[PDB]
Design an enzyme around this catalytic site. Structure first.
Site, PDB file in Angstrom:
ATOM      1  N   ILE A 124      22.182  69.412  57.678  1.00 53.06           N
ATOM      2  CA  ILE A 124      22.681  69.228  55.880  1.00 53.06           C
ATOM      3  C   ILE A 124      24.115  68.439  55.938  1.00 53.06           C
ATOM      4  O   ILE A 124      24.760  68.836  56.170  1.00 53.06           O
ATOM      5  CB  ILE A 124      22.801  70.350  55.249  1.00 53.06           C
ATOM      6  CG1 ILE A 124      21.451  71.255  55.304  1.00 53.06           C
ATOM      7  CG2 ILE A 124      23.122  70.046  53.658  1.00 53.06           C
ATOM      8  CD1 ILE A 124      20.197  70.386  55.086  1.00 53.06           C
ATOM      9  N   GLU A 125      23.767  67.077  55.710  1.00 50.76           N
ATOM     10  CA  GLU A 125      25.054  66.431  55.465  1.00 50.76           C
ATOM     11  C   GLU A 125      25.577  65.976  54.151  1.00 50.76           C
ATOM     12  O   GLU A 125      26.535  65.310  53.858  1.00 50.76           O
ATOM     13  CB  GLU A 125      25.000  65.095  56.493  1.00 50.76           C
ATOM     14  CG  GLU A 125      25.145  65.303  57.922  1.00 50.76           C
ATOM     15  CD  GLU A 125      26.032  64.230  58.349  1.00 50.76           C
ATOM     16  OE1 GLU A 125      25.215  63.711  59.634  1.00 50.76           O
ATOM     17  OE2 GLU A 125      26.963  63.746  58.359  1.00 50.76           O
ATOM     18  N   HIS A 126      24.971  66.340  53.242  1.00 48.92           N
ATOM     19  CA  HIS A 126      25.362  65.888  51.897  1.00 48.92           C
ATOM     20  C   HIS A 126      24.638  67.204  50.842  1.00 48.92           C
ATOM     21  O   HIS A 126      23.568  67.721  51.127  1.00 48.92           O
ATOM     22  CB  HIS A 126      24.928  64.616  51.161  1.00 48.92           C
ATOM     23  CG  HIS A 126      23.477  64.489  51.180  1.00 48.92           C
ATOM     24  ND1 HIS A 126      22.600  64.950  50.214  1.00 48.92           N
ATOM     25  CD2 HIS A 126      22.644  63.439  51.870  1.00 48.92           C
ATOM     26  CE1 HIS A 126      21.630  64.325  50.341  1.00 48.92           C
ATOM     27  NE2 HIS A 126      21.460  63.583  51.620  1.00 48.92           N
TER      28      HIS A 126
END
Ligand SMILES: OC[C@H]1O[C@@H](O[C@H]2[C@H](O)[C@@H](O)[C@H](O)O[C@@H]2CO)[C@H](O)[C@@H](O)[C@@H]1O
Length: 272
Positions: A124-126
């Site tokens: 999960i990057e955002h």
């Protein structure tokens, strides 16, 4: 040494196939990316760069028969994914469980056919923490119900991670591979490992997981910044890293680039 290497797979249509990737004998874990579409009223979808999802069934089985663990990564670098509501977390948890982590009941529904994956990777990057804590809780609950699989996460190098920080604090992850690239504040740059060495000390001391892996790009082109030559990683990093009880090995972004650079072969001495 006796190094365990994890590698991301599924980033290029033209890349070395999953079964050939496992046949190399270089990796303990192969992570398929990405399930990059979910939440917000959206139906879940995969972006595995045009590889046939059904075609991966025999390959995943072959990989497992050779003792290589195969994981599915949710989210990714880019994608219209989000878990803003409680219902979204519950919907995705149930969907990942039936279609990837359990053997089929009857079903024609499953993307990878009858393959049963060894785990889920949180990339999960955002989106912030959102309901990712709730999602992990339900997946963790299923793991306690008899379905044995692993939960992992790939946070950025700044601690605590803005997106997964609170979730990692729950100690739910079996392994973590910190991305020590694309961020000069905590990765290798300009013949200077200071920023990287200090980030590593923090993650190996504070991260509530059993295993922490160091994530590196396999090639200068694979990431915007943070590439570190194999001879330097072995000389610079390994002596201090293997002193840690939580040292897991290294993670490589990614299979497509490793095939070109032969980065894993050098770090192990060519094996096999
Ligand atoms: O189990 C699923 C299914 O994937 C199908 O491929 C789609 C791909 O997912 C989609 O993103 C792209 O736009 O089109 C391809 C196909 O032409 C694949 O065809 C199925 O065989 C596979 O089993």
């Amino acid at each position: 040494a006796n190094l365990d290497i994890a590698v991301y797979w599924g980033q290029n249509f033209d890349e070395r196939s999953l079964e050939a990737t496992c046949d190399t004998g270089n990796y303990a874990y192969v992570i398929i990316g990405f399930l990059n579409t979910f939440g917000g009223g959206q139906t879940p979808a995969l972006d595995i760069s045009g590889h046939s999802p059904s075609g991966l069934e025999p390959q995943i089985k072959h990989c497992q028969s050779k003792n290589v663990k195969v994981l599915l990564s949710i989210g990714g670098p880019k994608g219209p994914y989000s878990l803003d509501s409680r219902s979204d977390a519950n919907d995705l948890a149930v969907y990942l469980f039936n279609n990837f982590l359990l053997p089929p009941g009857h079903s024609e529904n499953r993307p990878f056919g009858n393959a049963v994956l060894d785990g889920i990777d949180f990339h999960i990057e955002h989106g912030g923490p959102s309901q990712y804590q709730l999602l992990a809780n339900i997946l963790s609950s299923f793991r306690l119900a008899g379905t044995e699989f692993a939960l992992t996460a790939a946070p950025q190098c700044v601690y605590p991670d803005p997106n997964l920080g609170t979730v990692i604090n729950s100690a739910t992850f079996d392994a973590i591979w910190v991305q020590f690239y694309n961020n000069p504040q905590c990765s290798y740059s300009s013949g200077n490992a200071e920023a990287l060495m200090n980030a590593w000390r923090e993650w190996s001391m504070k991260a509530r997981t059993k295993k922490v892996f160091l994530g590196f790009p396999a090639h200068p082109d694979a990431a915007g910044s943070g590439y570190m030559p194999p001879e330097k990683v072995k000389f610079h990093v390994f002596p201090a890293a293997k002193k840690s009880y939580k040292f897991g090995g290294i993670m490589l972004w990614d299979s497509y680039w490793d095939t070109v650079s032969n980065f894993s072969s050098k770090i192990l001495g060519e094996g096999w």
